A paper describes a structure:
Processing of single particle data showed that the T = 4 form of the capsid predominated. Examination of the cryoelectron map shows a clearly resolved HBV icosahedral core shell structure, with additional density clouds present on the 3-fold and pseudo 3-fold axes representing the inserted antigen. The density at the strict 3-fold axes is weaker than the pseudo 3-fold positions: this indicates that the NadA domains may retain their trimeric state, and that the flexibility conferred by the flexible linkers is better accommodated at the pseudo 3-fold positions of the HBV core shell scaffold (the linkers do not constrain the NadA trimer axis to be precisely aligned to the capsid 3-fold axes). Only minor changes in comparison with the native crystal structure were seen: the largest change was a reorientation of helix-4a by 4.5˚. Interestingly, the spike conformation appears stabilized by the base stacking of Trp71 and Tyr88, which could play a role in stabilising the NadA insertion.
FHbp is a lipoprotein that binds serum factor H, as an immune evasion mechanism, through a protein surface which mimics carbohydrate ligands.
Numbering used by the authors:
A (entry chain A), D (entry chain C), E (entry chain A): 1 to 76, 385 to 445
B (entry chain B), C (entry chain D), F (entry chain B): 1 to 76, 385 to 446
């Protein structure tokens, strides 16, 4: 079956395909952003939103992938570090970026950001404004 | 930080720890159970439960884990598959079994069951009833 | 003076002497069980029960012995640990079995269980029914 | 699992470390004091307080600590006797002093005294009441 | 004990860890900004906000640190000037920047600025807009 | 500019000047007094007083000052410690004592006390009562 990670949140994997690969900050930057803002909330047992629930799972799913990559790098191997942190870690960098942005800025603002980034990224460089659109408030 | 994936649901990882390894069916058998009788719920964009939101992530995580075992397979190598499906896949099977059971039976059926299994399995086998507590709809 | 710790709970150490000594599961199995579903209430300052109040003191007493048991194994040696975790810890496992089950299953039900299990033990084994009485929530 | 045994009684382990350590009368004196005038209440099958329940564990814990320290002194062996009266003794000696005082004077009288006494010894002697405060009924 | 300087003001030391070290203007720039805007208010004995109270203390705490660094540089030593004005003075540059910003722009705007800066600072440089977000009104 | 840290509180630095050096306990003894019986207030994010806001800054300032004395210690050197804890630490001890006293006793108890100590200590010892005015709850 084809479980769309985003479809319940009003987005889709085609919609985050507007964002480039090297747009997402690294996993360490996301987790610090999650820890500085929602450390009491993610470890809270209260349901405030399903954004928290998809964030708790994705943090632990990254905790598995570093553990397996540690297991490979100690038993089998430097290419594996290059593979996981780039080609597999991008999908974690999508899910971490999405729910941290939705909890901070609202679901509605994020979905309008993906369209507004889409205009920017489709625009030819000669007519593209110099700064990328960035989320705030 | 330390995040308990069950703490939302009135359960803890210690409560799920008393279940043995073989209590869980194989990882394919959970996903087939998910895909057969919750597929119209999972692929729907409706938040029908916090379980459904939580459950979708587990498929996507396991499909991510099997991507690497496939990758390490034809790049380097089969001992890795013995490590994932056995040692690390149990955490997926805990995760998959728990939501599917809470979706099929309710939380209250499962959360009473994990206690009643806990008092069962902690008892030594000389004093233990020979039949394990099964999970029923009551 | 000799204080019976179970006396104020409708029990006595006679009634817990019905149980065989190996029936009580290991200390880690009890401590994880109180950490499973009572970790909130134990660290809570709310007087919820005397069973809480007793159980807080029993954990801290248990952690105090292991602090001294590792001290002798650091400064004098594991026969000491073999002495504690068999003989003095057996009295500790009696409390941790007691108050956990009285909170989880009701104090009245536990007191009936001690009587009902004693019937099962004092029955000669050839006429003993194969299932043991065990606590659950049916 | 971090349990502060005084937290339900409106104190902390820190607030009882706030007193000087030699302030606390000896463990033998505390065991005789509860046996003097609470012995019928401790042997009673009816708690009149959670203090009674908490205090009954404290003898039975200290029965275990003296048993083990005896057992080491039977077969090995006197470092342990001084050690258990250095760290393990003081924890019980705070604990036995607290509930015996709470059953005698009430909680609020004790808890105000703990604040009052530790300020008194942490006051320079020329600018304080001359004699130490002591508990009043 | 771990006294968080910011926790009562809705922020935390993890939240100002989003801001870089060389983002904060020097102590002389903050004190002139405090003197040009709040000289009558800081020396006023009226409580308008606890932001004033934490600002009066932090100004005097900097007045101590320059006095001690003057004392070292005249009695013991050029490395000390490099140490205090960088590694110790940063924490004063945090507290001075925070309360001057909160008194001028509102507490709510400052806390939304730290999140909005966090997006900017986590963003990869190729997709980062050229100007940093800056407070106004 | 010149900022009086006490002017908010109905006191001045001149009013706190009449207190001698030895009237204040040692700096550890103030912080231990703060940490023992106001720790749940200070570490809470609630503005319960302007004193609590003011008091938190003093710990953080003293921890900043002791960072340097530790730094000058293992870099260069012990005469500096004699300068901080004695000459400059008194300004911390004035600051720490004042809020802790105003929290424990009220402002009005302290502000009457600093006057009654002022008329006491300004009087020469031949005419002075031999007992210092102590600070009491009245």
């Amino acid at each position: 079956m084809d479980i769309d990670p985003y479809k319940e949140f009003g987005a889709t994997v085609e919609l985050l395909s507007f964002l480039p690969s090297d747009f997402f900050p690294s996993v360490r930057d996301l987790l610090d952003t999650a820890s500085a803002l929602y450390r009491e909330a993610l470890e809270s047992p209260e349901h405030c939103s399903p954004h928290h629930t998809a964030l708790r799972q994705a943090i632990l799913c990254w905790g598995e992938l570093m553990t397996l990559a540690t297991w490979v790098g100690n038993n089998l191997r430097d290419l594996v570090v290059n593979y996981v942190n780039t080609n597999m870690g991008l999908k974690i960098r999508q899910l971490l970026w999405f729910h941290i942005s939705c909890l901070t800025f609202g679901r509605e603002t994020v979905l309008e950001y993906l369209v507004s980034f889409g205009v920017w990224i489709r625009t030819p460089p000669a007519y593209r404004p110099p700064n990328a659109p960035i989320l705030s408030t």
